[PDB]
Amino acid sequence: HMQKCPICEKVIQGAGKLPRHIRTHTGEKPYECNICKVRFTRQDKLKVHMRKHTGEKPYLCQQCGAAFAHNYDLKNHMRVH
Amino acid sequence: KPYLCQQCGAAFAHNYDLKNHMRVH
């Protein structure tokens, strides 16, 4: 459920989410992009970054099928609808 | 140090050393 960070005492929500918060203190970046060697504190941040290399666009507009890498681009797109 | 077991209170410097000890209990 939740835990207090033993460094700054802030309450961190989520079973398994304390390590990612601790790394905001330590600066450890355990995840590395295989292509451009850039490192990240979080697996999910690396995953979005790899879209730059794979060209993947998982955010799809149900009206016309326009495909985007970021949800805010999709949000911007939907004004035309 | 920052990775503390919530059952026996042993302190571990890295996350794996904490998760290595989770099998003891």
Next chain:
DNA sequence: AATCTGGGTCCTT
């Protein structure tokens, strides 16, 4: 203005 940071919840074995 676009993109990032850090923290939130849901799902799935």
Next chain:
DNA sequence: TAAGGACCCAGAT
């Protein structure tokens, strides 16, 4: 079933 994986978002660079 922990906790990995996925995704959202308010605020900041």
